[PDB]
Amino acid sequence: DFVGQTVELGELRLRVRRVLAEGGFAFVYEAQDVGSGREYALKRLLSNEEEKNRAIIQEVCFMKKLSGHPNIVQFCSAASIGKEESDTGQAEFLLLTELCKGQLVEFLKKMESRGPLSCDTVLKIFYQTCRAVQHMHRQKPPIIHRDLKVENLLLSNQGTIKLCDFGSATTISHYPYSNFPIGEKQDIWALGCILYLLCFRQHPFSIPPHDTQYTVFHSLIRAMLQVNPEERLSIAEVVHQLQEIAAARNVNPKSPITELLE
Amino acid sequence: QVQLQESGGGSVQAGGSLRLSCGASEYTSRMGWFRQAPGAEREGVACIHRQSNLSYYSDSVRGRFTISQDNAKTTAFLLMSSLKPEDTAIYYCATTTDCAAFVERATAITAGQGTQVTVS
Ligand SMILES: COc1cc(-c2cnc3c(N4CCOCC4)snc3c2)ccc1N
Secondary structure: OOOOOOEEEOOOOEEEEEEEEOOEEEEEEEEEEEEOOOOOEEEEEEOOOOOHHHHHHHHHHHHHOOOOOEEEEEEEEEEEEEOOOOOOOOOOEEEOOOOOOHHHHHHHHHHHHHHHOOHHHHHHHHHHHHHHHHHHHHHOOEEEOOOOOHHHHEOOOOOOOOEEOOOOEEEEOOOOOOOOOOHHHHHHHHHHHHHHHHHHHHOOOOOOOOOOOOHHHHHHHHHHOOOOOOOOHHHHEEEHHHHHHHOOOOOOOOOOHHHHHO | OOOOEEEEEEOOOOOOOEEEEEEEEOOEEEEEEEEEEEOOOOOOEEEEEEEOOOOOOOOOOOEEEEEEEEEEEEEEEEOOOOOOHOOOEEEEEEOOOOHHHHHHOOOOOOOOOOOEEEEO
16 A cells, blocks of 8 residues: 555655556555656565665665666665564665656557567667666676566657666676676677567577568677677677667667657 | 788788788687787777677778688688778787777787788
8 A cells, every 4th residue: 555655755755656567575656756746766675684685775776876878767866764664564665766658568569560670670679778788787897687688678758768677687896807707698698589589579499591671680699699608799799780780771779769659 | 829820911002902811720709800000009900700700890991891701710801992091000810709899999819920011
């Protein structure tokens, strides 16, 4: 019964309008600034263990560190409610972000009655996704997502892709001598599955033998789904290729995916 | 280490072409060239990912240089066309872990001895 309440994240005071997603440890709600009228996403995570406290704070720290990027959900603020104050009796963490328009897959579902996605549309979706992941792998040390899938991509109000869900992400702490791989290449394998899925509307786990539509993406799919992680492309190898594909097709791949706006 | 054997290059007229080749003593996943012009930084010029044939170029040579490889994946070739004074440099064959960082930073595992290219 969290819907209906009013909450305060510092300067901000705001009202809980409805549920957007339920799940395991967490729930997501639509929320409105009661003074300013501006709307927000609000994630509420429950903890009854110090272990969970650590995982939740880590997720908040990652969200904060990665904010500012056009393909990562914008962090607004965070807060906590102690076991003593909460309606659950557990500690509660509250994460405030910009509110996207909804889930990418819901918009694709609307359009898949209308035929396969054009290459330009695949290109925009996938580039914007890869640019979010590039922002993570460029951190020092790099941040590995570890849970990339097409279901946790959002579509912004501007019609762009927004990556969220940093609950599985990891990195190295107390980084002062190296650039060993530390997991980047698992994220790339996952991205290759997404490009495959967007083209052929099936999970890969073979590219169809006579496809003349998405042929432009075939070499990049195979190179991301390389079994040997050393052979497998880096995110910079992928993005560079996506940029040249876009230029050849006269597409600005950062632009709104207007077709998905209907 | 892998041993790299380089040939081709030399002197040419502006607007002309030359070809470099580089043979490696074993398989490696990625091979390319970087160069160093008089007083300039090391500059990654071209790189090829062997299993996919994806090819990477700096903006300075895009549309003028073409890197390729043989079926045995032992050798790479660089065709340098529409050459100009800016392309005068020593060109070094190299292997790398990442073609994109190679073009951006000339980051390599191993580098060859180098071939002089002089335009005009
Ligand atoms: C506006 O309607 C929706 C919005 C969302 C949705 C879910 N999570 C969001 C956001 N998150 C921010 C990170 O915390 C959890 C997910 S940001 N904007 C979101 C929008 C999902 C489904 C619907 N239908």
